[PDB]
Amino acid sequence: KLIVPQWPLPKGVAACSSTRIGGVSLPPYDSLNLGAHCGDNPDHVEENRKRLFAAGNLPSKPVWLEQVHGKDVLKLTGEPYASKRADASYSNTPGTVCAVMTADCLPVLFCNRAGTEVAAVHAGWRGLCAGVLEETVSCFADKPENILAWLGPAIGPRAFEVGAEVREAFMAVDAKASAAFIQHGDKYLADIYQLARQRLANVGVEQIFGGDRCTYTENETFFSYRRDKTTGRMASFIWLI
Amino acid sequence: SKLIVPQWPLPKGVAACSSTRIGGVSLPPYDSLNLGAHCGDNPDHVEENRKRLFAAGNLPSKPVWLEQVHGKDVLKLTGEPYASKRADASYSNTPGTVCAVMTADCLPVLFCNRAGTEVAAVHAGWRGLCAGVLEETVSCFADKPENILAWLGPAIGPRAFEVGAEVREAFMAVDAKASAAFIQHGDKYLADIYQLARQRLANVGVEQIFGGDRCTYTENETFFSYRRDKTTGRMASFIWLI
Numbered sequence: 171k172l173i174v175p176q177w178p179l180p181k182g183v184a185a186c187s188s189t190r191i192g193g194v195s196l197p198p199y200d201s202l203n204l205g206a207h208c209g210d211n212p213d214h215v216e217e218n219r220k221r222l223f224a225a226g227n228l229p230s231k232p233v234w235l236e237q238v239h240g241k242d243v244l245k246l247t248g249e250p251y252a253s254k255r256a257d258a259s260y261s262n263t264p265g266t267v268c269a270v271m272t273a274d275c276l277p278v279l280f281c282n283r284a285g286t287e288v289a290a291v292h293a294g295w296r297g298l299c300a301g302v303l304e305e306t307v308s309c310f311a312d313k314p315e316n317i318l319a320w321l322g323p324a325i326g327p328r329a330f331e332v333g334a335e336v337r338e339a340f341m342a343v344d345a346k347a348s349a350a351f352i353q354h355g356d357k358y359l360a361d362i363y364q365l366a367r368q369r370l371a372n373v374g375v376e377q378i379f380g381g382d383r384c385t386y387t388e389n390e391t392f393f394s395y396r397r398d399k400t401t402g403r404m405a406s407f408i409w410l411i
Numbered sequence: 412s413k414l415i416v417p418q419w420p421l422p423k424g425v426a427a428c429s430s431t432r433i434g435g436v437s438l439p440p441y442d443s444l445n446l447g448a449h450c451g452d453n454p455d456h457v458e459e460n461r462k463r464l465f466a467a468g469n470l471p472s473k474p475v476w477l478e479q480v481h482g483k484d485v486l487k488l489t490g491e492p493y494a495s496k497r498a499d500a501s502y503s504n505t506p507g508t509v510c511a512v513m514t515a516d517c518l519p520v521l522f523c524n525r526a527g528t529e530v531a532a533v534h535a536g537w538r539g540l541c542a543g544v545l546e547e548t549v550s551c552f553a554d555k556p557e558n559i560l561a562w563l564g565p566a567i568g569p570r571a572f573e574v575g576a577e578v579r580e581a582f583m584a585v586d587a588k589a590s591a592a593f594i595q596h597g598d599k600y601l602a603d604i605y606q607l608a609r610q611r612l613a614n615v616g617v618e619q620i621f622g623g624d625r626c627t628y629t630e631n632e633t634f635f636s637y638r639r640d641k642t643t644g645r646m647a648s649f650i651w652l653i
């Protein structure tokens with residue numbers, strides 16, 4: 171089964187986010203593991219990808235990134251790439267699939283109401299803190315007012331334990347980050363949805379959706395790196411039809 | 412009443428209890444003896460519920476709460492500098508140390524030996540049960556399985572535990588005895604977790620098995636149930652050497 175973002179989806183845009191359900195992989199990758207570098211059977215991963223691309227009605231294969239937990243955006247201008255080293259992608263080309271691979275990190279999908287540009291972001295805390303979302307938004311020709319954002323399944327505020335330094339880093343950029351951390355031993359529990367919403371507001375994006383799942387809690391629906399260590403991967407996808 | 416006392420031949424030197432949703436201070440949907448600190452409850456209420464339970468249970472120390480990940484790892488409670496509390500079972504041979512597991516549908520299993528020198532507590536979700544958490548816990552004991560007692564705590568029962576074909580498949584890949592513990596329910600099955608546990612226990616030589624008569628999902632006035640409620644409190648099961 172496939173998560174369909176609950177937002178006012180514009181006419182020529184289409185989106186989906188995968189779960190752990192309905193694949194072919196064996197534990198600890200059971201069953202719809204999309205990740206090719208976490209030690210799964212390579213023929214199973216290939217099979218899960220095929221089923222998910224069918225289930226999601228993707229028009230072409232996703233442009234998978236070399237995700238490095240940074241803040242760079244690849245503009246999906248053309249099929250042979252000089253380097254896919256990026257944690258976000260941007261497209262204004264019909265049929266081109268933006269894709270981001272996650273199991274705890276925040277997926278964010280963007281599109282404009284006019285339905286002429288899309289973006290997908292893999293926003294781990296470091297990339298989020300350093301401004302991956304602001305950098306993705308800045309790629310859009312449209313104005314932020316016209317931009318929709320969907321917050322995908324990520325590790326939620328009851329499970330995302332971070333060190334004092336992480337909380338420190340977020341407040342160094344934007345002091346109101348403080349409300350997104352709650353003390354918990356020598357650490358804090360952090361609300362990644364709250365932090366993403368703050369960055370998005372600071373940049374003018376007001377139509378924000380999703381943010382109601384937790385990859386760590388919902389173990390029957392999602393892989394979680396923090397929970398499992400060795401485990402599968404989900405992905406979120408957006409494209410212009 | 413905040414507490415269930417396992418009904419088994421409790422050895423001298425051992426004590427155990429398992430909590431209910433009754434007798435605490437938490438507000439709905441955590442009403443009222445919620446012990447879980449990570450389900451969105453008022454944490455002052457959670458600490459009061461814990462104080463109340465620990466008092467009533469006559470625990471000699473605070474529980475060694477695990478970071479439960481629904482796997483099959485057993486932490487031997489050898490001494491508080493631990494590299495990681497990521498585990499779904501614990502084992503102690505140290506008087507005064509409390510083994511504890513936190514549940515609201517998953518099977519709690521408490522273990523001890525007739526001599527009263529070793530205890531263990533297991534949070535057995537279906538994934539961990541399937542991958543062999545009970546067998547793993549049993550193999551931590553120095554004593555022989557014949558001298559091991561096992562108590563099945565309140566879990567989601569065979570009329571409520573609905574699973575996909577894949578769960579049945581997984582269990583029967585380990586042992587086709589497992590087919591007995593499943594009954595079709597549409598394109599689904601209703602699974603008997605107590606039956607699956609009893610099969611693993613027998614496989615391993617544990618013959619003295621008690622409890623397994625409750626249903627967290629049915630008894631909404633005694634137990635929290637994650638399947639029933641989603642946002643809800645947590646019970647826990649505890650055992651220790653006196």
Ligand SMILES: [Zn+2]
Nearest residue numbers: 194211213214
């Ligand atoms: Zn295969």
Ligand SMILES: [Zn+2]
Nearest residue numbers: 239272275294
């Ligand atoms: Zn990540």
Ligand SMILES: [Zn+2]
Nearest residue numbers: 326329384387
């Ligand atoms: Zn959670």
Ligand SMILES: [Zn+2]
Nearest residue numbers: 354355448449
């Ligand atoms: Zn905690």
Ligand SMILES: [Zn+2]
Nearest residue numbers: 436453455456
């Ligand atoms: Zn109160």
Ligand SMILES: [Zn+2]
Nearest residue numbers: 481514517536
């Ligand atoms: Zn559980």
Ligand SMILES: [Zn+2]
Nearest residue numbers: 573596597601
């Ligand atoms: Zn029915």
Ligand SMILES: [Zn+2]
Nearest residue numbers: 568571626629
């Ligand atoms: Zn029942």
